[PDB]
């Protein structure tokens, strides 16, 4: 509260190690699904169903700019992904099983870099 504050966490690297989990997500022989943007011309039903569109060039970009206040924003924005592709995908398609993979991938390294 007021003059009460909790002691500072050093989130100092924050920037460079998200930077570098997204380099390895990127590399990742199962991120092609994810690497720009779904053609929203091209593939029938995405733009109305998918209320925020995310991939991982423009979480690139985003980082980039400083456009992540925080790494939970930067979290929630891979995570959006990953939802997305499982609100589209059936689980037992290429692309829905690179998704799974990729969040699994994710979470791996976020919990050890993290927490």
């Given at each position: 509260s007021m003059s009460v504050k909790k002691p500072k966490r050093d989130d100092s690297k924050d920037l460079a190690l998200c930077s570098m989990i997204l380099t390895e997500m990127e590399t990742h022989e199962d991120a092609w699904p994810f690497?720009?943007?779904?053609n929203l011309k091209l593939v029938p039903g995405y733009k109305k169903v998918i209320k925020k569109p995310m991939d991982f060039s423009t979480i690139r970009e985003k980082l980039s700019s400083g456009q992540y206040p925080n790494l939970e924003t930067f979290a929630l924005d891979v995570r959006l992904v990953f939802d997305n592709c499982e609100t589209f995908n059936e689980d037992d398609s290429d692309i829905g099983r690179a998704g799974h993979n990729m969040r699994k991938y994710f979470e791996k390294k976020w919990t050890d870099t993290f927490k």
């Open positions: 690497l720009l943007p779904v």
